[PDB]
Structures are given as structure tokens and as C-alpha cells.
Design a protein around this ligand. Structure first.
Ligand SMILES: C=CC[C@@H]1c2ccc(OC)c(OC)c2CN2CCc3cc4c(cc3[C@H]12)OCO4
Ligand SMILES: C=CC[C@@H]1c2ccc(OC)c(OC)c2CN2CCc3cc4c(cc3[C@H]12)OCO4
Ligand SMILES: C=CC[C@@H]1c2ccc(OC)c(OC)c2CN2CCc3cc4c(cc3[C@H]12)OCO4
Ligand SMILES: CC(=O)N[C@@H]1[C@@H](O)[C@H](O)[C@@H](CO)O[C@H]1O
Ligand SMILES: CC(=O)N[C@@H]1[C@@H](O)[C@H](O)[C@@H](CO)O[C@H]1O
Ligand SMILES: CC(=O)N[C@@H]1[C@@H](O)[C@H](O)[C@@H](CO)O[C@H]1O
Ligand SMILES: *[C@@H]1O[C@H](CO)[C@@H](O)[C@H](O)[C@H]1NC(C)=O
Ligand SMILES: *[C@@H]1O[C@H](CO)[C@@H](O)[C@H](O)[C@H]1NC(C)=O
Ligand SMILES: *[C@@H]1O[C@H](CO)[C@@H](O)[C@H](O)[C@H]1NC(C)=O
Lengths: 320, 320, 320
């Protein structure tokens, strides 16, 4: 008859383990993000084989755009080009783009890595180098890598503040991430201060374990997962988040798969009543706020059906 | 034997009410938003202690950007600054920025509220006021509040149209918000017209109960929740949405937590072959369309398992 | 006694097919999209009744913006206007905008289709036509349709690459779309190459079944659904996606419902120290990546409860 008891204990254990007496529903989320911290740039780069110095200050209206769909981007490196205008000009001489005669390359060709429409006419590029030029924005951008020192090497010193508002539509519950009367100043830590949401990017990378400068050179994507494990029962009610970080990139390191994160952006203006654009190749770190969770409440129907299921189980256990 | 009959009524009630004979699956959504209504601005503001008049017209391409990830933003108030250019200039004199001696403040300091890198050199700012200047965009913006009258005071007269398309991947079902042959002209009302989705922002606030001007001055976030309670059974088939609204903000009213919604935006240009930006501090209302819902079809497996698990409930009650 | 066996066969069939021994949990996703392929524009349009020629090249930084919240936009057609500036100017002559006397139209009117604030003063517009002018951007844009040939007629020749990274929070599992050591060069096909994610816009339209030119003229929204049916049990483990394509639009073709996809964009500049904006009316194809899927692992509790539920189901059928 002791066996008749043991299953009962197991049953209770199972219930207490997973709250089968709790109708559970998914989560609806709203995220608001504020990034603060100014950056100083001062370094020496090279363009067209000529050295130049770049200096300036970025004031959080310059190196990012407002949050849109749970993803706020943070600039870390750039390659500049100015004076682009519509015309014909020789393309950056590569193996596929080199020629000695106009008949070498065909007009209208669209090489995947070429940024201009080819007219099939080989012309001298520079110092007796011959390539068949393209009709595009000119002068053509030189395809190189981002400068080895981080142009915004002070990126990890920034601070991001996150306000998360969760609501469950089944139950009548909506609550925020920050409760009234909380510590304003913070620096998020796993154990020292695990609740206030002020994140330092250096802290994020230290938790992840990667080198911030290396992935900042080529850009990358990561995510700040927010876990809401809330119980709505009055007897034991607690609804508090847990923060985790994870690198969302793959570290492919293959040229064909576009390693890291980067894009191209254009600024237009009028010079001498002529349209002229300047091109910025931006490498950055893209943060995602992946908030997920479940919320449940005591419900009679789930308890009844689970008891009905367990009844036959222990009846059979007694039978055999 | 009546006790053997009350369980039948209870089980039928539960099965009919919660629809246990249905395979409930989540929802996949697509949202498309169009905002229409022009606005006129005409007011008197003050900059550097001098009064100026601002007037103009915004044409639904000037005060918003296209929908991106279920969130379309609407401008409400702005603070302007022009002639920004790289240099060194005294910071806006506050308690943490004032100084009387050169050694008063240290070079390289980055105050959280200061927008420039501090070089630690106390210089006269204006009428014998001394602060240690910063090397940044100049002249420095004056941190003030948004003007008490709403610069976009005619914001609540706008009209927003929402087209929602839901698909369930389990079942072969996809349907839209607007059925063919429906009233074009509308103004959404709780009871007068509860289905056509033309929303007025003033009505949006009126349903919530908050004053439009107060939230508009400092900005805020609210949600337009769309609830799809659809049943796919042929006998009782109805799939129509219900519209609800809520304020997603917190009303913190604390300076340290950045009350309301605002951001900073820049427009670059060339003046005398010199880079010059102009800065806009934007306060606005960011709308979110938080769509959720469930749907299910009749399934033999769910009905069979529920019947098998509910049989023991009366099988035992007969014994006792 | 065979009836005792048919129920066992049915139970085993249901358990194997629908996987009752699994703890099914939702999916968390991250998407990274790269669009490549240059476009050339060369055509003849008409503005103000005068013919003009438009030519140029778009280089994947001109006709799109970076991915933001699972939606990347692609240019396909545009209408240009330049020289806009704040002032008073006659509105485009329509039925609601025409007048013969000043008292005919009342000041302050806001017609839904009018883009300017009306001052109620009938003035000559062009060759003895009379309309009451509006205080707005000038000269007023002429409301027309997009040019019948596709300005971005080569749009279907572009290539889009998609990197999807999924994680399940319940189990300790995260995986990406592309496995190491895969074919780089690709063109997606239903049967020839169904796994590598390089998509051609012409290919996806062909799979959908609609012509590219007609949809591109007025714009539309379609989704790239990615389905992850992953099983985490070690015995039979396979986590590979299935690609499906669908058109998210409605084909309303009604003027009041804004058929197709389009918006208005502005570029600002300074000419003769006067602010002057230029307006672009954009018709484009907005792509969505609607990712969804489920995954689960072997769990003792689900197996136990399902057996306890089916025990009564077979026991009662044994009785009768
Ligand atoms: C890419 C983000 C910032 C971008 C950038 C990059 C390099 C620069 O120096 C070379 C810039 O000038 C100083 C800027 C200016 N901003 C303004 C904010 C901004 C916002 C954007 C964007 C680009 C920019 C560039 O794409 C969509 O949303
Ligand atoms: C912030 C939204 C509108 C912005 C703005 C603010 C103040 C102004 O008075 C000087 C503006 O001129 C009339 C404009 C013009 N637009 C164009 C649309 C637009 C779109 C944006 C944006 C800013 C703007 C500014 O940030 C990302 O997406
Ligand atoms: C609307 C997308 C592209 C837009 C456009 C339209 C017409 C043009 O001439 C015909 C343009 O010049 C070549 C451009 C340039 N870009 C840069 C990228 C871009 C990005 C955007 C945007 C507009 C543009 C315009 O709205 C928010 O995000
Ligand atoms: C409710 C609250 O914030 N209490 C205290 C606050 O008074 C104090 O300034 C801060 C110092 O870190 O610690 C916390
Ligand atoms: C199918 C349909 O739209 N029917 C009518 C429409 O004819 C009428 O113009 C409108 C007036 O509000 O009411 C509705
Ligand atoms: C692992 C791998 O990619 N193997 C081959 C690759 O070597 C080859 O270049 C390609 C040709 O399409 O087919 C594949
Ligand atoms: C970050 O800030 C700390 C102190 O504020 C400073 O010591 C450190 O050098 C900074 N790092 C960078 C990369 O600017
Ligand atoms: C909104 O519009 C109504 C009528 O169109 C007008 O009476 C009212 O004054 C307007 N409100 C604002 C703030 O412009
Ligand atoms: C697309 O490309 C193919 C081959 O690259 C070419 O034959 C075809 O004409 C192109 N279509 C357009 C519209 O440019």
C-alpha cells in the first residue's frame, strides 16, 4: 500500500514543479531605449595613398538613430569619401577589373563586386594602369578594410538605459521594469547590482567574454535577453526580470558571407548648383532587446483536468 | 444518481466555454500604417534670451518617417539650433560647469550632462560669466524645456489608417482587417462605429482619458492593441478584431529617468565649403500597434484526449 | 479482444504522429539581411507638361535603408520635385480646388487631398485658371501616377542574402540558418537548391505568380516566411528551415484605400542662405521576413500525463 503512496508524492512533486494548476499565456512587450555618452575621435588614416588626420566629437545625435523595433544601433567605425557625382570614371583596379584593351572587357557587364555600370572601354586609371571605366558616382571608392585601431575606441564607455513594459492580455496585468523608488545611479553587475538596467557596453562584452575592440573593428550583432518569470498567485507573487547577454553573430570570417556588420550611407547636398553626395561606410555594433516570458494564474479547469488525468494513473498503479 | 449527472453538466459547460476541442495556434501578423493630415505652426519662442517667431507648415512627409517594425512616430514639439560647427566654446553655465580659476576644472572630464569634451581651461562665457570651455559642436545648445503651448497643437486632428493582415501557419488561413465593400469615411467610436479603423489621435487620448496637450509637450508612448478572437469552425465562424488603447508610458516625472519621449536629430550641409550641422530636439508621440490573438480548428485528437482524461473524473465520483 | 488492440494502435499512432512526449516551446529569432545588386535608370518623364530625361545609377546605398525590425525596403519607382520653399502658391486645379470668386472658397479649409493651408483668396494659377492659393511648400506638387515603365526596371535582378539565427530559451539550443561548409554561389529553387538562402526578386515573384512590373509600378508588401520544424531528440534530430513566399498585400485597387505602397520623403539643403527642400514620392516593394517555428525535447511529465489520460480512454472502451 506504500506504493500507492509514492506515486501520490510524485504527483504532488510534478504539480509543484510545473504549476499544472496555472493557466499560462504569452507576453506582450514594449521597449524604450536611451543611449548616453559622448565620443571623441582623433586619428590618422590614409586615402588614395595620402595620409590625413580625422578628428571630431560625436554627441549621441550623430552616431545612432532612435530605437525602432527593439534594435538600437551604435556606430563604432567609418570610412569616408567625399565629392561623389554622376559621371564616368575608372574603377578600383582588381583582377577582374583590369584590362589592356577595350575589347578585353564587355560593355554592360555587372560584376558582383563592381559598383558601376561598365561601358567596355579600357582607359588609363593612374600611372599607366588601365581599367575599363564605369558610369557611376565618381571618384570610385577604394575597397579596403576598416582602420585597425577603433575610430570610436571609447565606445564601451557609453551607458544604455532600458525601460521595458510588459502586459498580459488574458489576465488583467501590466507592469514595468523599474519600480518606483529605486537606485538611479548604477553599473549593472551579475551579483553586485543585478536589477537596475543601466548597462555599460564593456560590461556586456566582459559578461559575453569577447574582445570589444576586435569585434568593433568589423562590427557585429548581439542581444540583451530579458526574461520575465512572473507568477500571479496572491500567496506567492513575484514578477521580476533576469538579464542575460549573448553574441548573436556567427564569427564566419569568410569574405563571401560579409563578415561582421556594416552598411553604406549617403549625405546629399548642392555644390555650385550641382548635386553631390558623400559616402560613409559604417561598421557598427547592433544591439537587440529580445524580451520573452510567460505569465499564468490559478485556474479551476486546469486543476480539474490534471486531477482527472492523475486519477487513472494512480488507479492503474494500485491495480498492478 | 443526480450527482452522477451534475458532473456531466459541469464537463459540458467547461468544454463549451473554453473550447477544448480546438487546436489553438499562435498568430503571425503584418501591419501597414498611413498617417494623413497637414499641420500649421505659428508661435513665438526665445533663444539666447532673444525673442523670435517660428512659422511654417508640415505635410505628413515632414513630421514623421515611414512605418518600421509596428511603430510610427509623430512630431509634436521641437527645439531648434543652427550654425553648429566644430570648435571650442564655453559650455552652458550650470553648477557643475561653472568655474572661476583655470585649475578649477580638470581637462578631459566628461560630465554626464555635458555634451562636449572638457579641456580644463576657464574662459569667460558671457557678461563676465566664466566656465571652462569644451571642444565640440558650437555654439552649445541651451538645455531648456519644450514650449508650454504645443508647437504642433493641431496634432490631435490627424487621421491614421491601419491595414492589418493576419495569417495562421498551422491552418491554411489568412485574412485582412478590412473586408471588401465597407464604409470608407469614418471616425472610430466605441459603439457608433467600432470596426472601421480610421483613428483620430484626439479620440485616441479621449478613450484613455488623458489630456492631449500635457502628454504632447513632453512626449509619450501608447499602444493600439488589436485583438483577433477568431474561431475557424464552419458552424460558428467569425473572425473580427476588437480595438483597445492604452498608455504605454510610466509618468515617472523624474529628471534622472528622462521623462516623456524625446530625441536629438541632425541635418548636415555645406556652407562656404565648410561642414555645418543644424540640431533639432524632437518631442513626439510614438505609437505602437501591439497585435495579438489566437485561433484554432476542430481536431479529433484534442477531443479524444480530453474525453479520456475527463472520464475518470466521474468514474471516481460514482464510487464516492 | 481485437477492440482492445485497435485502441492501442490508435493511441500509438497519435503519440508517434503528434509527438505528445515533447515539451513544445516558442521560438526567439534574429534576422540579418544584405541586399546586393546595382541598378541603372534612364527614361523620359514629364513635369509641368514639359518633357525631361532622368538618368543615373543606384548603388545599394541609394535605393534602400538598413534592415530595421524584420523589414527591408527596395526602391522601384519615384517622382521628383525640386525648389520647394515656404510661401504662398496656387494649389493643383481639381474640382474641390477650383474657384471663380474669392468668396467661393473659405479661408482655413483643410481638404483631405490638399497639401496646403487655404487662405480663401482665388488667384490666377496658369493660363486664366483660377484657384485659391495655399500657404505651404512651393511650387505645389502635381498629383499624378507613377510612370508606366518601371523606373527601376532592373529591380528583379537583385540578390538578397538572409542570415537567420534562432534560439529556444527553454532548452539550451541556439542555431543559425547557414551551416559551416556550404555552397556560396546559389540561386534559390524549390527543388534544385532549396536550402541556400540567396533570393532573386524575379524568382520570388515567379514563385508567387504575379508579374513584377505591375506590382512594382504601385508597390506592394510581401513576406518571406521561414519555417523551423526542429526536433531536439538525439535519436531523430534535424533542425532545418523551409522557405515559403506569399504576397501580404490585398490588391484593393480603390483610390480611398491608397492602393499599393508609397510614401513621401524630403531632402533639405541651403541655397543662397535660404532653406530649400526637395520632395521624392517613393513607390517601393517592402519585404518582410515572417519567421516562426516550434521546438521541443523529450520530457517525462508529458509522457506520464498522456498515458494517465489514455488509460481511462482504453479502460472504458474495454468495459463496453
Ligand atoms: C550610421 C549612423 C550615423 C551616420 C553617420 C556616420 C558617419 C558620420 O561621419 C563620417 C556621420 O556624420 C558625422 C554620420 C551622421 N549620422 C546621422 C544619424 C544617422 C541616422 C541614420 C543613418 C545614418 C546616420 C549618420 O542611417 C539611418 O539612420
Ligand atoms: C523628427 C522627425 C522629423 C524631423 C524634423 C524635425 C524638425 C524639423 O524642423 C526643423 C524638420 O524639418 C521641418 C524635420 C524634418 N524631418 C524629415 C523626416 C524625418 C525622418 C526621420 C528623422 C527626422 C526627420 C526630420 O529621423 C529619422 O527619420
Ligand atoms: C526612399 C529610399 C531612398 C531615398 C531616395 C529617394 C530618391 C532619390 O533620388 C531619386 C534618392 O537619391 C538617389 C534617395 C536616396 N536615399 C538614401 C537612403 C534613404 C534612406 C531612408 C530614406 C530615404 C532614403 C533616400 O527614408 C528613411 O530611410
Ligand atoms: C529610494 C532610494 O533611491 N534610496 C537610496 C537613495 O536615497 C540614495 O541616494 C542612493 C545612493 O546610491 O541609494 C538608494
Ligand atoms: C458598401 C458601402 O460602402 N455602402 C455605403 C456607401 O455606398 C455610402 O457611400 C456610405 C456612406 O457613409 O455608406 C456605406
Ligand atoms: C564545401 C563546399 O562548398 N563545396 C563545394 C565547393 O568547393 C565548390 O566551389 C562549389 C561549387 O558550386 O560547390 C560546393
Ligand atoms: C573609459 O573611461 C575610463 C574612466 O572613465 C578611462 O579610464 C578609460 O581610459 C576609458 N576608455 C576608453 C577606451 O576611452
Ligand atoms: C481641430 O479641427 C476642428 C475642426 O476641424 C477645429 O474646430 C479645432 O479647432 C481643431 N483643433 C486644433 C487644435 O487645431
Ligand atoms: C536581368 O539580367 C539578365 C541577365 O543578367 C538580363 O538578360 C535581363 O535583361 C535583365 N533584366 C533587366 C530588367 O534588366
Amino acid at each position: 500500500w506504500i506504493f500507492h503512496a509514492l506515486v501520490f508524492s510524485y504527483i504532488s512533486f510534478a504539480l509543484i514543479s510545473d504549476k499544472r494548476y496555472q493557466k499560462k499565456e504569452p507576453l506582450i512587450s514594449s521597449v524604450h531605449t536611451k543611449v548616453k555618452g559622448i565620443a571623441e575621435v582623433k586619428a590618422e588614416i590614409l586615402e588614395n595613398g595620402m595620409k590625413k588626420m580625422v578628428s571630431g566629437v560625436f554627441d549621441t545625435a550623430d552616431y545612432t538613430f532612435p530605437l525602432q523595433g527593439n534594435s538600437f544601433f551604435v556606430m563604432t567605425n567609418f570610412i569616408k569619401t567625399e565629392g561623389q557625382q554622376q559621371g564616368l570614371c575608372p574603377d578600383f583596379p582588381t583582377a577582374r577589373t583590369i584590362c589592356s584593351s577595350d575589347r578585353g572587357c564587355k560593355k554592360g557587364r555587372m560584376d558582383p563586386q563592381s559598383k558601376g555600370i561598365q561601358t567596355g572601354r579600357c582607359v588609363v586609371y593612374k600611372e599607366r594602369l588601365k581599367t575599363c571605366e564605369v558610369s557611376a558616382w565618381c571618384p570610385i571608392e577604394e575597397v579596403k578594410d576598416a582602420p585597425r585601431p577603433a575610430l570610436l575606441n571609447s565606445a564601451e564607455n557609453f551607458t544604455v538605459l532600458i525601460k521595458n513594459n510588459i502586459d498580459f492580455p488574458g489576465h488583467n496585468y501590466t507592469t514595468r521594469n523599474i519600480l518606483p523608488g529605486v537606485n538611479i545611479t548604477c553599473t549593472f553587475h551579475k551579483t553586485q547590482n543585478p536589477q537596475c538596467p543601466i548597462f555599460r557596453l564593456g560590461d556586456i562584452f566582459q559578461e559575453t567574454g569577447d574582445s570589444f575592440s576586435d569585434v568593433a573593428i568589423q562590427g557585429g550583432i548581439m542581444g540583451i535577453e530579458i526574461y520575465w518569470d512572473c507568477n500571479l498567485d496572491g500567496w506567492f507573487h513575484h514578477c521580476r526580470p533576469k538579464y542575460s547577454f549573448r553574441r548573436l553573430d556567427d564569427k564566419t570570417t569568410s569574405e563571401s558571407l560579409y563578415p561582421g556588420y556594416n552598411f553604406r550611407y549617403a549625405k546629399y547636398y548642392k555644390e555650385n548648383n550641382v548635386e553631390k553626395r558623400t559616402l560613409i561606410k559604417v561598421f557598427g555594433i547592433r544591439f537587440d532587446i529580445l524580451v520573452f516570458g510567460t505569465g499564468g494564474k490559478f485556474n479551476v479547469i486546469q486543476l480539474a483536468v490534471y486531477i482527472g488525468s492523475v486519477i487513472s494513473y494512480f488507479g492503474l498503479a494500485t491495480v498492478f
